[PDB]
Each structure stands twice: as structure tokens, then as C-alpha cells.
Amino acid sequence: AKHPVPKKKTSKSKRDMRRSHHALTAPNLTECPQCHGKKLSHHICPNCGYYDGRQVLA
Amino acid sequence: MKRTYQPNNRKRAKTHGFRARMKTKSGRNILARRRAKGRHQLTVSD
Amino acid sequence: EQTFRNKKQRKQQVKLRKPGFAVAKYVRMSPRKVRLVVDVIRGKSVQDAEDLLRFIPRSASEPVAKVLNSAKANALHNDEMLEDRLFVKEAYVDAGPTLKRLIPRARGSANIIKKRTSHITIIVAEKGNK
Amino acid sequence: PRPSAGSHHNDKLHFKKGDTVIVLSGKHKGQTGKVLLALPRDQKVVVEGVNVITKNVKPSMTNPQGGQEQRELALHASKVALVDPETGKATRVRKQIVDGKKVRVAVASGKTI
Amino acid sequence: VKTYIPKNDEQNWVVVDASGVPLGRLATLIASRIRGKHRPDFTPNMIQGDFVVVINAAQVALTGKKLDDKVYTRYTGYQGGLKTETAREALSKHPERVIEHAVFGMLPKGRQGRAMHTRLKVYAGETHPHSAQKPQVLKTQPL
RNA sequence: AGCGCAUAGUACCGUGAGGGAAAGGUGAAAAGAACCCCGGGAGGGGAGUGAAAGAGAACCUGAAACCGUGGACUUACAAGCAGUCAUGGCACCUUAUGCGUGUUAUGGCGUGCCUAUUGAAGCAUGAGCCGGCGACUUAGACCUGACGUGCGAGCUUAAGU
RNA sequence: UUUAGGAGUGAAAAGCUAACCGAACCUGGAGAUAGCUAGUUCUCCCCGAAAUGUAUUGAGGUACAGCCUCGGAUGUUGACC
RNA sequence: GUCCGGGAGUGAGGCUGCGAGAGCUAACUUCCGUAGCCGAGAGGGAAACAACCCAGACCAUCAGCUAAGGUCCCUAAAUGA
RNA sequence: AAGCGAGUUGUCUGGUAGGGGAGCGUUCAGUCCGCGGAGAAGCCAUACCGGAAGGAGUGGUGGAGCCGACUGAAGUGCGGAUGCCGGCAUGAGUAACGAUAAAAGAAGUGAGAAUCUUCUUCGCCGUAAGGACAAGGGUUCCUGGGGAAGGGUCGUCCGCCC
RNA sequence: GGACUCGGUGAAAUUGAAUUGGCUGUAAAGAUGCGGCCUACCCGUAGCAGGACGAAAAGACCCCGUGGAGCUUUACUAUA
């Protein structure tokens, strides 16, 4: 049992305009509460370990 | 279940195993049909 | 106006080896996805290259970046350059030694796969700005 | 194998133990070839000709040091052999005294040792 | 010495009239400008037109006994019920949504005229709402 | 390529006699390499070795579909696998010489090749590409015939020296 | 463990002999031969067609002739008027 | 006008004109012959499209006219009488 | 000393099976004074000429030879034979990790540890998916050890490899 | 439990080549690159079947083939 084989292909031309509707979101937004610079999307260090107060640990 | 062969080769000793082509003289040449006949080693001792 | 005549030199007299070099080969992730973690780092090495590739919600810093600075391990003082410098002009890769292995599939006559492999390429030599 | 030897020179060169010679072929031309044992059937020879530099490691064995003298390279005979003087006249001639083990008399301008 | 494309630079169109629809130089005076009126240096090949400042032309009326009849069509590839050939004064809820579609015979084929569909742009209200396009107001009665 | 063997008809295919690979090459010579780095190590630095290490410890030169990046230029509002020219359009000027090199919105329009086909441009079929194999010839008084020549009374086999 | 190949087995299906037996496989006899049909390789200067007739257990098979090229030739014989 | 020879092709076509045959004179169905055409060459006209009106070429020139086709436009050419 | 045409007129048509006819060049062979170290032959690119095929100007790189005119020989030349092998492919990063018969964690280690290890808790089989004898694989079991590769993640686990 | 977030692995049957919309028409009449006309901001992925005259072995139903094999009948005939 085989469903219509490949035949025609899609090398160049196409397979180009396919790294843009996704790619990677591109970031570099924030740089930590106070010291140094990590932070993530709303999330404390591991440096000083804090958004503004006591947490995590060096 | 049963395959098509399985181990135990007695009928490849005193029949068709090394020295069993004398019982059948015109099998001696058959034994000698790939040793003293053409190139290659043999097929009963790898 | 460097050299031309006497082609037994550039064979005998040349010193050095090849400034840069760090490529550990193998890679194990297609010459198509290698570039995917190099076509983002068009600037600042293990500065805004690392974390850009170190911290990236997956696995692509180990033998991706840890070898990408194996050049630096040699650029320690075995290779040229500096620290507050370095560049890497662009990026390019290829395939490499593989190994027939497979694991039967099903239908047809036979199944035919390839373990696939690459060649990382990691260099830090001929620069620009200072 | 590391193709060097020069075993494509063919084993019939006579040489043995104890002898004073000069050199040629290039690289040096300032090197009195001498002493040595030679190696019939593939021969190695270096003399004080080429001043190699080949640092051995320094485990915990006995070597710990390095070196930088006495080590292999290449270049067999074919330089400047025979002649107490220096050039001209071969030598492979031998007295009718048997003892091929070390026959001694050479050509016209030859030596008997 | 040929032509050159100003690429929008040297243009000086003349505002259309609609000062009384006609029956002969209506769907054809659509040219006499777009293709090359007087021709200052009309560069063939690529497109090259000007602000066909059309007006009201509600005055429009077509021929006589053969008024409410024309090759209307629609084209979709199906003949069961498509291709509504609504007569003139039957399709008379638009007539500013056709008419202009009289330049469907004058386009250098390919692109070109499939770009001149800008100078058209409705218009059937007798000068008011000229906010559609303010620039020209050159008039010049039609011969 | 040549016997399948330029050190294998390894492993084996396997129900059985019986069928089998693929694969060579660094320079004369390895001198196939001490000495600090990331690293688990593989792999990569210094520097000798190396006449010549863009030979390089799976190694001559090393062309290519696919495949690695940037850049001088154009491009999503423009429509046809493709085309060639055509005014423009950015670049360059290995000879100011309003002359060209790397090119394109777009225009006339314009449908592929092989190739068994009356017959098409086809959806008639063969085709993803790379590298080779790519066939009426070879011995034969088998014969006819163009040309040059031997002779007009002409031309030779078997091997014996 | 003998039965085997043109035999045995057999609940007859014309099922099986080792995943297809309308008569096993492998080394060997010849490549079954083939008017079928895929193809039969670099680049060319001047010329040029038949599915008409006769033949055929003969037909998209093939033979030949009018039908093409070339060597020699036909000293008045051409076709039109 | 005038034969001897090395060697072909591949035998199974299409259409308009010329008339019949099987035929509700129906069929790029089928048989026949006779000019052409496409099997071996492109166009204008014909929307583009094998036989239809005109015309079959040595490679190069953004030089001229004839026939068809046209003298409103998308792309030539008097809405001249 | 191998035959050659301007001056000119018609033909120079386009050609499928075909007739007469020219060549580009590689390998073998003749003559090698030879051509190459400033290095030719291997190859990458530049508007001279040629009936087309092709012959030409130079570096690049490369490492030891190589072709020539008069000549004969040779498996003398399609990318294209749904060929054959060798490699690159794309189906495309999706479908899928395997019988859907639960697992969390402390801690050993170290290169980070979720699937190792010392272990309290859970559950599936237990006429079983227990243990021994039968065939088989022959190196399984261990003292353990290292990722190149394999166990279709990988891993500091193997019965990989010593 | 698969279809969607993420880490690794990812092949085969097949295939000239996609700036790969449609009509109606035209064509050895089943045209999307042909005619003439209309029309879309380009791309990504989920999902669906009308679609390429879907795929596979060059229908093996049939005919052509001075093909084969197989069985039967007093077919011509050999023959234990």
C-alpha cells in the first residue's frame, strides 16, 4: 500500500521563504531587577537571586 | 513453529559431510567439484 | 608583492600552522541546524553570543558553544588575537564520517537510513576593527 | 610504516665498523662521517650531520629531561665515501687472499684498510 | 534619443468632465491620455498614465433600443447559474461600478492596465467630496 | 579500471549444494611531534619537526547537483515551467574617448528535451543529480565495388634454410 | 527417519517439497531466441520518399518495382506550344 | 530522350478540392484514384491551432516595396469621399 | 612537388532511412634537435580566430614531465539505456521512541544529573513476563574499567570495547 | 492515547522542471504555462479531499505473438 509517491520535489526557490513566519522571536528585553542582569520573562536572577527581595542563592 | 531446517546435522557427516562421497564414487568427483576443479576452498569446513 | 618565485618555500619556510581552528567535527545535528545557532550570533562573542546560546530553552550550548570557545582555549596563547577583540567573519559547515547502522522497518524490500553528521567549524583569526 | 630508509639504494655498499669519511649531497658538506655500525637490509644512519631537536617527555620513568641530540631522520650513504684523500678512484677490488669478511686492497690510488 | 520614465515627476493631466455622456467617444476617449495624449516623452514598455479626474457621468445612458442589454458576464468557470447578465436599468443600482469598466479593451496586456485601475476609482456625484483627490481641477471641455 | 583476490573471494546470503564484497596512493624519509589552554574525551592553541605540513597521524592535486555566509543591484502588489531581445534601473570605468563591464520592473509574445509516434507543445512516454559502462564489429582467399599501385600474358599456400 | 523432482505427500485444492511449483533449488547446457522493444555516444557541406501493386500459414513481418545519392552513359530521342 | 550497379525507407497516414461505394449523401468512420499539404521548414490572415488567401529563405543592417490582412483602441495602418 | 578560383548567372532549397565530403582531440606507435623550475602537465577564469566541434591571451594552483607536425592504430565522445554501483538527495523535521502492564524523592557521584547507586513509601506478573533440565548462540558472569559507535534521546549502566 | 510547547533520532515508494488562480474556449476535444477575460499583500502551520489523467509491476480481463508451460480427447504420431 503506497499513496501517491513523491515525484515532484521542492529543493530551492522555496525552502527559503520558510524562515520568517517563525524563525525565533528575537528577544533582549529586560536585564534584571537591580544587580548584573538576567531576569527572564518575570523571573528572578540566580545572581543576587531577587526581583526586589530575598530569594535564590549565589 | 517449525521453520524449514533447524540445527542437528547428522545428514552432513556420514552422507554429505567431509568424508562421505566414497559411498557414492561418482560423488567423489562431486566432492572434488570445487577443490581440484576450479578455484575456491570448500564448503564443509567454512 | 609578498612572494611568488621559488616554489619550495611555502613548503619549507612558513612557520605557524593555521590561526584559529577549534572544529571538533562530528557535531551530530545536520549541516542545516548547525548554522541555526550561528546565524544569530552576528555579534559579541560569549558576550551577547553566550546566553543568546547558553540560555536558550533547549540543548544547544554543550558542544555547540563549549567547543565554540575551544578556539579560545587555544587562543589562550597558542593562537593569535586577544580578549577585548575577536571577530569570526561569517559561518559555514559540511558533512563528515558516518556509520551504517539501521534498524529494520517493515514493508517493501529494505529500509535505508543514515545516522547523519556534520563538521562544526570554529575559527577566530583574521580580523578588522581594534 | 614511515617510508624513509632509502632501502631502494640496494644492499652492496661494503661499509662496516670503523672508518673515516667526509660528506656531500647537500645540507652540510661540513661533517666528517665516521664510526657507526650500519644496517644491512634497511639501513639507518645520521652521524653528527643533522642536529635534530626531538624532546622526549618526562613521565616518572627515568627520562625526565628532553634531550636535543642523537635521534633518527634519514639519508643513507651516497654522499662522500672511501678515499683517505677525498675524491677519485673507486675501491672495490680484492686481494687473492680470500677472507671476503674484510678483504683490504682497493684500486690504483686505493688503500689496504 | 528615446524616452525616459520620470517615475512620477513630469505629468500634467487634465480633469475629465462627465459634462454630458456621449455615444462614440465615451469608452474610447478613455485613452487620449493614458496611452499617450500629445505625448511629452511617453515611454512604452512600463506603465505611464495620469490622473484621469473622472466626474459624475450619472448622465450616462448607453444606446437606445439596445440599452438594457450587454455582454455583462462574470467568469468563474461554471455555467449553471453564474454569469448574471443583469440588464442596464436592472443593474441600475451601481452604474458607477461598471461604465468605468470600459477600459477593458485598452491595456497593453499583462500588467500595465492591471495597474491603471487607480485613475478610475468610482465617482458619480457632481463635484463635492473632492477629498477623494484634491490636486488637479483643470477642466478643459471635451471635443 | 584489470579475474571476484595489487594480501578479503572478512563477516557471510542461508533451507541446501551454492552467490559475494566494497576498498588501493603521505613526502625520498615520517622525522607520524616535549612544552601552558576549553574539555570527560574526541577536536581545536602555541612551536620545532616539515627544503615545501592550503602532505598533514582514515593523508596528492581536488572539478560538481545538494550544501555555508556576506555583499554592489533589483523585488511582493506582481502573476505563467522557461525563453531571447528589448528603454530604463544600482554598479565598473585591466584604454575622459555621453562608450562598457556584474544586471532588472517590465514588453512581443513565446509551451520543455529525449524520443517507439501519420500524428502534439502536451496530460504519450523516459528522466533528481553527479562519476563510467554507451554495442552490426572481430578472424575468416566469406564476396561484390572507389581510389593508388603490381603487372598485360597475371597473381600465390603450406614453413624448409 | 526413509520418501525426491518430473516422484512422493495428500481430507482431492489440481493443494505442497522448505515464504510462488500449472512439475524445487543451486553449479552446469545457449544469451530461449526474438521480425517485440529501450537504447545504440562529439560537431557537419550540397541532394531526397513509400501505408501505391504484385507475394506470403502473409499482414504496424518481410521481397521487389516506380520512388534518393553516386560511376559510366544516352552526339539530337526531351517535355510546352 | 538515354540503362548497369553499393546501398534506402518502412508499408500501418490526414485533410480541402474531384465523385461514388457501406450510409437517416451523416461520421478529422470507412474504399478508390487525382493537386496540394503535414510524416521531412517558420509567418501574416486565421483569437493562438498540420492541408485555407499570400509566401518557402546563405549569415549578418533598428534601409525599400508588394499579397493577404487592416486603415478606433489594448499592439501598425484615412470613423476619406 | 598532394590541384586551386576571384570577375558572373541560375542553383547555394530546410531536411526524416541515405549518397560524395571536413574535422576537434585523447590514448598506442615514428622521428625527438625537443617543449618545463621564470616549473609545464591537474585545474579555475578574461569580448582573437574558427563552418560547428573547438584552437587562443594569463594567472591562479599544483607537482613532477609532456605532448608536436607528415602518419597508422584505439573499448575515439549522448546528461539522458525508467539502467547498475558509489556518493549527495528530498518526502522534513513533521508521523513516530514499540504492545498506555502508575510513580515521587532523599542521598552516592561529578561535567551538569530525570530515568545508576544505600533506600521508606506505588503498582503489573507471579500456571508468570519464576528457577532447573532441551536446541541454540559461544562468550554470556565477574575484578572493574573509557564514549569513537552502537542500545532508534542521550547518559558517568552493557552482556560495546580491555 | 495521537493533532499543538521542547530536547535526539527521521527513512522509504517516487520523481524533467513550478512567478502551482479560474473561466469559457481550443487542442489526437479531461489545458492550470494556449487563446480572450477577471482576479490575489507575500509567507508559515493546523486540517481536508476535487486535483496532477494519484502512486506500484510497461493490465497479467482481452487481441495481436508461425510465445511457453500446464490438462484432457480416438487430435498426426512415438513409446515402456
C42: its cell numbers: 552576528
> Can you tell me the distance from the alpha carbon of E142 to that of B6, in angstroms, rounded to the nearest whole number?
105
- Per residue, the 3-state secondary structure of chain D, as one string, reads CCCCCCHHHCCCCCCCCCCECECCCCCCCCCCCECCCCCCCCCCCCCCCCCCCCCCCCCCCCCCCCCCCCCCCCCCCCCECCCCCCCCCCCCCCCCCCCHHHCCCCCCCCCCC
Contact of C105 with C13, CB cutoff 8 Å: no
Which bases of strand F sit closer than 7 A to a protein CB? 4-5, 9, 11-12, 14-18, 26-54, 56, 58, 66-70, 76-80, 86-88, 105-109, 128
Give the CA-to-C1' distance from E108 to F84 in angstroms. 20
Write the DSSP assignment of A1-58 as a string of letters: ---S---S---SSSSSTTSSSSS---------SSSSS--TTT---SSS--SSSS-S--
State the Cα–Cα distance between residues E89 and E95, nearest whole angstrom.
Answer: 9
**Environment class of C36 (CB within 10 Å of its CB; exposed 0-12, middle 13-18, buried 19+):** middle
Q: Which helix (H) or strand (E) holds B30?
A: helix B25-31
CB of B10 lies under 7 Å from some atom of strand F: no
SS3 E85: coil
3-state secondary structure (DSSP) of residue E117: coil
Q: CA distances (Å), E132 to each of C61, E118, E121, in order?
A: 58, 12, 9
The CA distance from C53 to C66, in Å, is 10
* Three-state secondary structure of chain C: CCCCCCCCCCCCCCCCCCCCCCCCCECCCHHHHCHHHCCCCCCCCCCCCCCCCCCCCCCCCCCCCCCCCHHHHHCCCCCCCCCCCCCCCCCCCCCCCCCCCCCCCCCCCCCCCCCCCECCCCCCCCCCCC
> Is the minimum CB–CB distance between A24 and chain C shorter than 8 Å?
yes
E11-43: burial string, b at 16+ Cβ within 10 Å, e else: eebbbbbbeeeeeeebbebbeebbbeeeeeeee
Helix (H, G, I), strand (E, B) or coil at E108: coil
Nine-digit cell at D78?
A: 651516497
Distance E113 CA to H2 C1' (A): 72
Burial class (CB in 10 A: 0-12, 13-18, 19+), C65: buried
Q: Which helix (H) or strand (E) holds B31?
A: helix B25-31
Residue A41 neighbours by CB under 8 Å, 6+ apart: A29
Alpha helices in E84-140 (DSSP H): none
Residue with cell 612572494: C3
Q: Where are the domains of chain B?
A: 1-46
The set of cell numbers assigned to A10 is: 521542492
C1’ F109 / CA E108, Å: 12
d(CA E60, CA E58): 5
Grid cell 456625484 in the structure block, residue: E125
Solved by what technique? X-ray
- Residues with Cβ within 8 Å of C46's Cβ and at least 6 positions away in sequence, in order, are C65, C69, C72
The vertex-D35 CA angle with D29 and D38, nearest 5°, equals 95
Within 8 A of C48 by CB-CB distance, chain A residues are 28
- How far: A4 CA to J49 C1' (Å)? 13
C104 min Cα distance to partner chain A (Å): 18
Cell of C92: 559555514
Cα–Cα distances in angstroms (integers) from residue D2 to residues C3, D12, D42, D69, E106, in the given order: 32, 23, 13, 21, 84
Q: Which residues pair with D112 in a beta bridge?
A: none
Nearest-CA distance C42 → chain A (Å): 13
Residue ranges with strand state E in E57-121: none
Residues in CB range of E70: below 8 A, 6 or more apart: E62, E85, E87, E88
Dmax (CA) of chain D:
58
Counting DSSP H helices and E strands in chain B, the numbers are 1, 0
Contact D39, D75 (CB under 8 A): no
Residues of chain A in contact with residue C107, where contact means CB-CB under 8 angstroms, are 1
Kindly provide the resolution of this structure in angstroms, with one decimal.
11.5
Residues in C touching A28 (Cβ below 8 Å): 48
Q: What is the spatial distance between Cα E118 and Cα E51, in angstroms, rounded to a whole number?
A: 9
- Cβ–Cβ < 8 Å for E15, E137: yes
CB nearest C40 (choices: A1, A24, A38): A24
Compare all CA atoms of chain C with the CA of A39 and give the residue at the minimum distance. C55
Closest nucleotide to C27 by C1' from CA: F43
Which residue is it, cell 445612458?
A: E61
Which residues touch D73 (CB under 8 Å, ≥6 apart)? D4, D46, D50, D52
Which nucleotides of chain J does any protein CB come within 7 A of? Answer: 6-20, 22-24, 36-39, 42-45, 52, 54-56
